[PDB]
Amino acid sequence: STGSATTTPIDSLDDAYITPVQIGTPAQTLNLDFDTGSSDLWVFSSETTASEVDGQTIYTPSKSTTAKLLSGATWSISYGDGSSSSGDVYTDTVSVGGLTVTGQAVESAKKVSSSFTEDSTIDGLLGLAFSTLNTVSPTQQKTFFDNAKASLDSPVFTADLGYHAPGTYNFGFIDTTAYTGSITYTAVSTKQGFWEWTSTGYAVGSGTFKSTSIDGIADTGTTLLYLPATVVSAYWAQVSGAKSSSSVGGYVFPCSATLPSFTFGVGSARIVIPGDYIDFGPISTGSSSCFGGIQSSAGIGINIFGDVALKAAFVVFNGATTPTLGFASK
Numbered sequence: 001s002t003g004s005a006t007t008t009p010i011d012s013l014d015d016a017y018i019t020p021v022q023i024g025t026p027a028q029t030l031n032l033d034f035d036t037g038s039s040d041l042w043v044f045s046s047e048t049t050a051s052e053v054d055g056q057t058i059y060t061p062s063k064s065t066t067a068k069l070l071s072g073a074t075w076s077i078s079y080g081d082g083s084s085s086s087g088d089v090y091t092d093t094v095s096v097g098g099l100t101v102t103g104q105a106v107e108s109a110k111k112v113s114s115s116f117t118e119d120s121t122i123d124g125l126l127g128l129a130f131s132t133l134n135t136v137s138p139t140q141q142k143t144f145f146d147n148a149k150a151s152l153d154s155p156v157f158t159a160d161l162g163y164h165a166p167g168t169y170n171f172g173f174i175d176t177t178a179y180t181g182s183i184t185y186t187a188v189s190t191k192q193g194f195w196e197w198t199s200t201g202y203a204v205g206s207g208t209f210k211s212t213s214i215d216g217i218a219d220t221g222t223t224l225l226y227l228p229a230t231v232v233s234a235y236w237a238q239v240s241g242a243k244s245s246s247s248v249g250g251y252v253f254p255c256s257a258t259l260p261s262f263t264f265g266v267g268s269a270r271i272v273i274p275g276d277y278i279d280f281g282p283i284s285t286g287s288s289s290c291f292g293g294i295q296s297s298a299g300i301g302i303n304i305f306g307d308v309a310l311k312a313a314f315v316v317f318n319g320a321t322t323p324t325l326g327f328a329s330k
């Protein structure tokens, strides 16, 4: 089997991407944020505290003939930005882009934190990291990909995120028309539950490539590119007037700037992030200070190749017995 679904930016900045997902019988379509940095499929629901729902589409398990309470199971998760959600669990039929999994754990939110409530565009998350990170207790549950894998033509999914445009998540096949050149594959460590890999270095603009190992995660659920302070300082030093602002919470730059590109290494291959991808616009409406899309990972504890990086590539998440990651230009 295979699946193919379009993923769409939630706003003009590509702050996140949403992908329609069919849950239950008859189908209830919710727009979920596919997150290769977590492993829970959770949704706004008929169980979500009413005051914490503001415009999201909800899953109502009582209206699904295939929903079953997973008795005793609870979940609770926090994300890198301090947001969180928790609740109980149903199993139900879940389809993405024509690919169907029966008996998928659908984690129904009883509580969500304010930043979820305040974002009406995201109806939940669909985790695509390794199932060892799944938070369901006392019986840990498998991700949609883990459940689908044995049925897929090939045990892979691909992320092809657009810059200010829709893109595609495919399951079970590699669309050879969706990228240019060849795909370069690189080793993955699953020891922390992430798609963790080591970049071979970087360049800023037209500068020389610096060969240096940068361990990090391929994370579709993080907006920005978070890298070591040394790397980030070298990038922003090439932008007149750029500075790190403790009050704003990262590097800002004059909105009048033209940003340089940023290149990262994948083995001997190179992925170029155009400068425009690194512009996250005014820090507040009407401001002439703009927020940078490359930020320091110092304090996070891990480097994160988030959407800023991934959208510059066609990315293969290879879930074979020994997982790997592939990157191609596009």
Ligand SMILES: N=C(N)c1ccsc1
Pocket: 035, 036, 037, 038, 078, 079, 080, 219, 221, 222
């Ligand atoms: N859920 C994620 N994408 C995440 C959380 C901490 S670091 C990455």
Ligand SMILES: N=C(N)c1ccsc1
Pocket: 016, 033, 079, 081, 083, 115, 116, 119, 122, 221
């Ligand atoms: N609402 C949030 N803070 C969020 C959205 C996707 S991951 C976290």
